[PDB]
Design a protein around this ligand. Structure first.
Ligand SMILES: *[C@@H]1O[C@H](CO)[C@@H](O[C@@H]2O[C@H](CO)[C@@H](O[C@@H]3O[C@H](CO)[C@@H](O[C@@H]4O[C@H](CO)[C@@H](O)[C@H](O)[C@H]4NC(C)=O)[C@H](O)[C@H]3NC(C)=O)[C@H](O)[C@H]2NC(C)=O)[C@H](O)[C@H]1NC(C)=O
Ligand SMILES: *[C@@H]1O[C@H](CO)[C@@H](O[C@@H]2O[C@H](CO)[C@@H](O[C@@H]3O[C@H](CO)[C@@H](O)[C@H](O)[C@H]3NC(C)=O)[C@H](O)[C@H]2NC(C)=O)[C@H](O)[C@H]1NC(C)=O
Ligand SMILES: *[C@@H]1O[C@H](CO)[C@@H](O[C@@H]2O[C@H](CO)[C@@H](O)[C@H](O)[C@H]2NC(C)=O)[C@H](O)[C@H]1NC(C)=O
Ligand SMILES: *[C@@H]1O[C@H](CO)[C@@H](O[C@@H]2O[C@H](CO)[C@@H](O)[C@H](O)[C@H]2NC(C)=O)[C@H](O)[C@H]1NC(C)=O
Ligand SMILES: *[C@@H]1O[C@H](CO)[C@@H](O[C@@H]2O[C@H](CO)[C@@H](O)[C@H](O)[C@H]2NC(C)=O)[C@H](O)[C@H]1NC(C)=O
Ligand SMILES: *[C@@H]1O[C@H](CO)[C@@H](O)[C@H](O)[C@H]1NC(C)=O
Ligand SMILES: *[C@@H]1O[C@H](CO)[C@@H](O)[C@H](O)[C@H]1NC(C)=O
Ligand SMILES: [Ca+2]
Length: 948
C-alpha cells in the first residue's frame, strides 16, 4: 500500500489536468465575458418573491371566482325551472328530445350532433346542446327519468351563456338525484360502464357535510355463508363514499365487540387508511353469539373519544346485520337520549329472521333502514344515506349554498388532473305557499364546474425564474393542488398482486424531501398565514439519483376567496432575472438566422424549448419539427405581433446571438481537443447548441432546459458536475457518447449574481483512461466515484464495462463501510406516484422507496482499514476539489474471499410507511368550519321500515 502524499499528488494531477480541459474545451470563462461585452443588449430586473406570490394568488382567486359566478347562475336557474315544472305521467303524446351520451324509442326523441373537433378538450364536442348520461341499470323512459329530462332542459340555455361569457370554461355538469348527469358541451361517453354520478367525489362532498361514520358489522354465526360475502362487499362499497374530510372506523361484534384493524379509533379515511380497513374487512370470519348491547356500547364509546382528530360533525352508525329479536333500547337511552347520533341499519342477504328490531333502531334514532338482498342491491343502497344527511343542509337555506372545491382527481371524460366546484340544488316547489316540507327536504342534485390544473399553471408563469424555482399550492389538508412532482397518475397504496375513482391526494411532505423547517412551513400555510423563510435544504435532482444542498426562500400567501395557500420557492442567485431589451429588425434577424436548421454545420446541432411562444405555434415532441415551425413564424409574421408574447421570443433570439458567438469565436477555432465527444451549451432561453452536428444524436436530454437534470444540478454547485451515464441500454452510447461534465456560468453586471447558461463537455472513456493509467492488475483496484456513489471508470477493465453503475452493486463490502466512515450520507423517501411490474399470488401503481447518496462533510482525505472477517483491507479515499468526484485506492476483491449482500441504489417496491403508527401522530390539518346537522325542523318520520 502506497503513502498518502503520493496519492494526494496522484489525485492532484486528476484535478488540474481534468478541470483545465473542462475549463478550456467548453469556454466557461469565455461565455461570461460574452455576456459582459453586450451588457447593454439586455437588462437585469428584480424577481420580487413577495410581489409575485400575491399577484399569482390574486389571479387564482379571480379564476376560482369566475367559476363561482357560473355555479350560482346554474343553481338559481335550476331551482326556478324545477318549481314551474308540472309532474305529468304521459310521455307518448309529448316526447322528450335530448342527446344520450352513450349511443351510436317512443316517448323520447334523440338528437344527432355535429361533433366538431375543438381544443382545450381532447375529444369531439358540440357547443349546441348538453349531453345526458344515464346509468346502465337506470331505465330511461321511466316516469321519474323522463320527468327529469324536461325541467333539465332550460339548463342548456344557462350552460351556453356561461360558456359565451367565459370561453375557457370546461365541463359544466348537473348531477341529478335520479341518477342522470347532464353536462355541457355534449361529448360522447367514454367494457361495462359502471359510472354513477351519485357516487362521484364531487357529488358526495356537496350532498352532505363531513361525517364521522362508524361501521358495525355482525360477524356472529347466523351471518356465515352468502350473507357474509354480501356484508364484506357492502362495507367495502360504503368506504368508497368517504373522502379525506370524513373519519371512519370498522368494528365487529360476535358476543364481544372488537375492532377489525390496527386502528382502535377514528382515522382520517384517506386512501391509505381506507385500504387497511378494506383489507381487514375481507378477513373476518362468522362465528359466535349475536349480542347487540355489547356491539352498540362499543360504537357509542368510539364516537365519544375527543382525544384524537375528528370531524366534529355528523355522527352516524351503520349496523350490518341480518336480523334478530333484540331492540337494545337500554343502550340507546343511555348513550343518546338527545338523539345526537344517527343510526342506519342494513339487513343483508335472504333469510327468515325478524327485521322488526332492526327497523326500530333506525326510526327512534334519526336514521334510515335499508335492505340488501343480493350483490346488485349493494351499490344503490350504500349511497342513499346521503339523502338523510342532507336534510339539515336543506333547512339551512341560503346559508348552505357555499362553493366547495374537491381534491385533485382524474376526469371521467379524460382531460387530465382537474378540480371541480360544487353547489347543491334544492327542491323549492310550493315555497311561495310555505307548506310542502314533504320531498323538499331532499336535494335535486349537485352543480359542478371543472377547473383543470393546466389553467392554474398558466396563472403562475415560470420562465422568468430559474430552473430551480417553482410555485406550489396546498389544501387545508397538506395535499398539493399544484406541484412539479404531482403527476397525472393515481397514487399507490401497496404492492400490486394478481391471483378516476380515487382522488390524486399527494401530501406536500410526500411531494419533496421532508425537513423539520418544511413541516412548520406547511403548518403555517394550512393556518392561512403569510411569511417568508430562507434556509438550507436538501433538494433532489430531476433524476432520482442525486441529492443537492442549496439555499431556498419559501414565500407564501393565502388565497383570499378560497382555502388554498400559494407559495413560491425562489432560490438564491435567482432573485434577479435577465429581461431581453432589443428593438431592431436586422440585429434581431442576425439572431434569427442562427437557428436555421440548414446552417447547423458551422453552428452546431441547435435545439429549441417547446414553450408557448405564441398561441398559434403548436408544440410537438419532435424538436426537429418544432424548430422547423418556429423558424417559419418569426419571418412570415412580424415581431411586432400583438398576437403573442414579447419577452419569450426576444429572450430566445437574444440567447442565439450570445450562444452562437461562442460556437463561432471559440468552439470553431478548434475541432479536436484530446478527447471531447461533444461541446454543449444550455441556457435559460431554451436553446442547446451541441457543436459537433454528428454528436447531436447522442444528446438524449429534454429540449426544455427547465427540465434538464444536469442543468439544475450544476446550478446549485459552484464547481463542476460530472453526470454519470445510465446502465443496461437505458440510453444510446456508454463510451459512444461520453461523460457529461457540467459547469454553470456566473456574471456580475451591477454587483449582481446571475447564472444564465450552463456549459460543459462530454469527455470520452477511452481518452480518460490513458491519463488515469499514468493498470488491469489483480492486486489493487483504483476507481473514481462521483457524488452519489456511481462508477465512472476503474482499473480492472471489468468494472469499466459497467460504468455509470452504483458502487454498491459491484463492490458491496467497501460501499457499506464507506457509509459507516461518514463520507456518503443517504436519505430514503417514498414515491407514491410510481408504476411497477405486477407480482404473483399489466403494470399497476405502487410505492417504491428511493435512495440517494451525497457527501457528508467537507473532509478532503479519507483512509482506513476494511475488516471483512479474517481479512485486513486498507484504502485511501481522496476527494477531487473543484469537482464532485472522489478517488479511492483499495486492494483487489480477490485478496479476501468475502462477499456480503449487495447494496442497491434504485427504486424498490415497498408498502411503507406503516399506517398503523401514522395515525397515532398524524400530520396537522384544518377541517371545514361549517357543519350542518341536528336541525329541529327535520322530519324524522321517513325510515325505510316505518311504512313497510
Ligand atoms: C320536488 O318536490 C315536489 C313536491 O314537493 C315533487 O312533486 C311531487 O311529485 C309526486 C310524484 O313523485 C306527486 O305525486 C302525485 O301523487 C301520487 C303520489 O305518488 C301519484 O300517484 C301514484 O303514486 C304511486 C306512489 O305510491 C306511484 O307509484 C304511481 O306511479 C302514482 N301514479 C298512479 C298510480 O297513477 C301521482 O301520480 C303523483 N302525480 C300527480 C298526481 O300528478 C306529487 O303530487 C308532487 N307534488 C307537487 C306539489 O307537485 C317533485 O317530484 C320533486 N322533484 C323531484 C325532482 O323529485
Ligand atoms: C316538458 O313538457 C313539454 C315538452 O316539450 C313542454 O311543454 C310544451 O312546451 C312548448 C314549448 O314552449 C309549448 O309551446 C309553446 O308554449 C309557449 C308557452 O306557453 C307558448 O308560446 C305557446 O303555448 C306554445 N307555442 C305555440 C303553440 O306556438 C307547449 O305549449 C308546452 N305544452 C305543455 C302541455 O306544457 C315543457 O316546456 C317541457 N319542459 C321544459 C322545462 O321545457
Ligand atoms: C387577502 O385579504 C387580506 C385582507 O382582507 C389582504 O390583506 C391586505 O394586506 C395589505 C398589505 O399591506 C394591506 O395594505 C391591506 O390593508 C390588507 N387588506 C385589508 C382589507 O386590510 C391580503 O392582501 C389579501 N391577499 C392577497 C393575495 O391580496
Ligand atoms: C383521553 O382518553 C381518556 C380515556 O379515553 C380520558 O380519560 C382519562 O384517562 C387518563 C388515563 O387513563 C386519565 O387521565 C384518567 O383516567 C381519565 N380522565 C382524565 C380527566 O384524564 C381522557 O380524559 C382523554 N383526554 C386526555 C387529555 O387524556
Ligand atoms: C438527510 O441526511 C442527513 C445526513 O445523513 C440526516 O440528518 C442528520 O440526522 C442526524 C440524526 O439525528 C443528525 O444527528 C444530524 O445532525 C443530521 N444532519 C443535519 C441536520 O445536517 C437525515 O437522514 C436527513 N436530513 C433531513 C431529512 O433533514
Ligand atoms: C375570468 O378571470 C380572468 C382573470 O381575472 C379575467 O379574464 C376575468 O376576470 C374573468 N373573465 C370573464 C369574467 O369573462
Ligand atoms: C440488464 O439486466 C441486469 C440488471 O442489472 C443486468 O445484470 C444484465 O446483465 C442486463 N442484461 C442485458 C441483456 O443488458
Ligand atoms: Ca345471529
Amino acid at each position: 500500500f502506497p503513502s498518502a502524499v503520493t496519492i494526494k499528488s496522484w489525485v492532484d494531477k486528476m484535478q488540474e489536468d481534468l478541470v483545465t480541459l473542462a475549463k478550456t474545451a467548453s469556454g466557461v470563462n469565455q461565455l461570461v465575458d460574452i455576456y459582459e461585452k453586450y451588457q447593454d443588449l439586455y437588462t437585469v430586473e428584480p424577481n420580487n418573491a413577495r410581489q409575485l406570490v400575491e399577484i399569482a394568488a390574486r389571479d387564482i382567486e379571480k379564476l376560482l371566482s369566475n367559476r363561482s359566478k357560473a355555479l350560482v347562475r346554474l343553481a338559481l336557474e335550476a331551482e326556478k325551472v324545477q318549481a314551474a315544472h308540472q309532474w305529468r305521467e304521459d310521455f307518448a303524446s309529448n316526447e322528450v328530445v335530448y342527446y344520450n351520451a352513450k349511443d351510436d324509442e317512443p316517448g323520447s326523441q334523440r338528437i344527432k350532433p355535429v361533433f366538431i373537433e375543438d381544443a382545450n378538450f381532447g375529444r369531439q364536442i358540440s357547443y349546441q346542446h348538453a349531453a345526458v348520461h344515464i346509468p346502465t341499470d337506470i331505465y330511461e323512459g321511466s316516469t321519474i327519468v323522463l320527468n327529469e329530462l324536461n325541467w333539465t332542459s332550460a339548463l342548456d340555455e344557462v350552460f351556453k351563456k356561461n360558456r359565451e361569457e367565459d370561453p375557457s370554461l370546461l365541463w359544466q355538469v348537473f348531477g341529478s338525484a335520479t341518477g342522470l348527469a347532464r353536462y355541457y358541451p355534449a361529448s360522447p361517453w367514454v367494457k361495462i360502464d359502471l359510472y354513477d354520478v351519485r357516487r362521484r367525489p364531487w357529488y358526495i362532498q356537496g350532498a352532505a357535510s363531513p361525517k364521522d361514520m362508524l361501521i358495525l358489522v355482525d360477524v356472529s354465526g347466523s351471518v356465515s355463508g352468502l350473507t357474509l360475502k354480501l356484508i364484506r362487499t357492502s362495507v367495502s362499497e360504503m368506504l368508497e363514499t368517504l373522502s379525506d374530510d370524513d373519519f371512519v372506523n370498522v368494528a365487529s361484534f360476535n358476543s364481544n365487540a372488537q375492532d377489525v384493524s390496527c386502528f382502535q379509533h377514528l382515522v382520517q379515511a384517506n386512501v391509505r387508511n381506507k385500504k387497511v380497513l378494506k383489507d381487514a374487512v375481507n378477513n373476518i370470519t362468522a362465528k359466535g353469539i349475536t349480542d347487540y348491547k355489547k356491539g352498540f356500547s362499543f360504537a357509542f364509546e368510539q364516537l365519544l373519544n375527543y382525544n384524537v382528530s375528528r370531524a366534529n360533525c355528523n355522527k352516524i352508525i351503520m349496523l350490518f346485520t341480518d336480523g334478530g329479536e333484540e331492540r337494545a333500547q337500554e343502550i340507546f337511552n343511555k348513550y343518546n337520549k338527545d338523539k345526537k347520533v344517527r343510526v342506519f341499519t342494513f339487513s343483508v342477504g335472504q333469510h327468515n329472521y325478524d327485521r322488526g328490531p332492526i327497523q326500530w333502531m333506525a326510526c327512534e334514532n334519526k336514521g334510515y333502514y335499508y335492505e340488501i338482498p343480493s350483490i346488485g342491491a349493494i351499490r344503490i343502497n350504500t349511497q342513499e344515506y346521503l339523502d338523510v344527511l342532507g336534510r339539515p343542509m336543506v333547512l339551512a337555506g341560503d346559508k348552505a349554498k357555499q362553493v366547495q372545491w374537491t381534491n385533485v382527481y382524474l376526469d371521467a371524460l379524460e382531460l387530465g388532473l382537474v378540480i371541480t366546484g360544487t353547489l347543491p340544488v334544492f327542491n323549492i316547489t310550493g315555497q311561495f305557499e310555505n307548506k310542502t316540507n314533504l320531498k323538499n327536504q331532499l336535494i335535486l342534485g349537485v352543480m359542478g364546474v371543472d377547473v383543470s390544473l393546466e389553467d392554474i399553471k398558466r396563472l403562475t408563469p415560470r420562465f422568468t425564474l430559474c430552473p430551480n424555482g417553482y410555485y406550489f399550492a396546498i389544501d387545508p389538508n397538506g395535499y398539493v393542488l399544484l406541484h412539479p412532482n404531482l403527476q397525472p397518475k393515481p397514487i399507490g397504496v401497496g404492492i400490486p398482486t394478481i391471483n378516476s375513482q380515487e382522488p390524486v391526494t399527494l401530501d406536500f411532505l410526500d411531494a419533496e424531501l421532508e425537513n423539520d423547517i418544511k413541516v412548520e412551513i406547511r403548518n403555517k400555510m394550512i393556518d392561512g398565514e403569510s411569511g417568508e423563510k430562507t434556509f438550507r435544504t436538501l433538494v433532489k435532482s430531476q433524476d432520482e439519483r442525486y441529492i443537492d444542498k442549496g439555499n431556498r426562500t419559501y414565500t407564501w400567501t393565502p388565497v383570499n376567496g378560497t382555502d388554498y395557500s400559494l407559495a413560491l420557492v425562489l432560490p438564491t442567485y435567482s432573485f434577479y432575472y435577465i429581461k431581453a431589451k432589443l428593438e431592431e429588425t436586422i440585429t434581431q434577424a442576425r439572431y434569427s438566422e442562427t437557428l436555421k436548421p440548414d446552417n447547423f454545420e458551422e453552428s452546431g446541432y441547435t435545439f429549441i424549448a417547446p414553450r408557448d411562444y405564441c398561441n398559434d405555434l403548436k408544440i410537438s415532441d419532435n424538436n426537429t419539427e418544432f424548430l422547423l415551425n418556429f423558424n417559419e413564424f418569426i419571418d412570415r409574421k412580424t415581431p411586432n405581433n400583438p398576437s403573442c408574447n414579447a419577452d419569450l421570443i426576444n429572450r430566445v433570439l437574444l440567447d442565439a446571438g450570445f450562444t452562437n458567438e461562442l460556437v463561432q469565436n471559440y468552439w470553431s477555432k478548434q475541432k479536436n481537443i484530446k478527447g471531447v465527444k461533444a461541446r454543449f451549451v444550455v441556457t435559460d432561453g431554451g436553446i442547446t447548441r451541441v457543436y459537433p452536428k454528428e454528436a447531436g444524436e447522442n444528446w438524449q436530454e429534454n429540449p426544455e432546459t427547465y427540465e434538464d437534470s444536469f442543468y439544475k444540478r450544476s446550478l446549485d454547485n459552484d464547481n463542476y458536475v460530472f453526470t454519470a451515464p445510465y446502465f443496461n441500454k437505458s440510453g444510446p452510447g456508454a463510451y459512444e457518447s461520453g461523460i457529461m461534465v457540467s459547469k454553470a456560468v456566473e456574471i456580475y453586471i451591477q454587483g449582481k449574481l446571475l447564472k444564465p447558461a450552463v456549459v460543459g463537455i462530454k469527455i470520452d472513456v477511452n481518452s480518460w483512461i490513458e491519463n488515469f493509467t499514468k493498470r488491469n492488475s489483480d492486486v489493487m483496484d483504483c476507481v473514481i466515484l462521483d457524488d452519489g456513489g456511481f462508477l465512472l471508470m476503474a482499473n480492472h477493465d471489468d468494472y469499466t464495462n459497467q460504468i455509470g453503475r452504483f458502487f454498491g452493486e459491484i463492490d458491496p463490502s467497501l460501499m457499506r463501510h464507506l457509509v459507516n466512515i461518514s463520507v456518503y450520507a443517504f436519505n430514503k423517501s417514498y414515491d407514491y406516484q410510481s408504476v411497477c411490474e405486477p407480482g404473483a399470488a399489466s403494470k399497476q401503481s405502487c410505492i417504491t422507496e428511493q435512495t440517494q447518496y451525497f457527501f457528508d462533510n467537507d473532509s478532503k482525505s479519507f483512509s482506513g482499514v476494511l475488516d471483512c472477517g479474517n481479512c485486513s483491507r486498507i484504502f485511501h479515499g481522496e476527494k477531487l476539489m473543484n469537482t464532485n468526484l472522489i478517488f479511492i485506492m483499495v486492494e483487489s476483491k480477490g485478496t479476501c474471499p468475502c462477499d456480503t449482500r449487495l447494496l442497491i441504489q434504485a427504486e424498490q417496491t415497498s408498502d411503507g410507511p406503516n399506517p398503523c403508527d401514522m395515525v397515532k401522530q398524524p400530520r396537522y390539518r384544518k377541517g371545514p368550519d361549517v357543519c350542518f346537522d341536528n336541525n329541529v325542523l327535520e322530519d324524522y318520520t321517513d325510515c325505510g321500515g316505518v311504512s313497510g
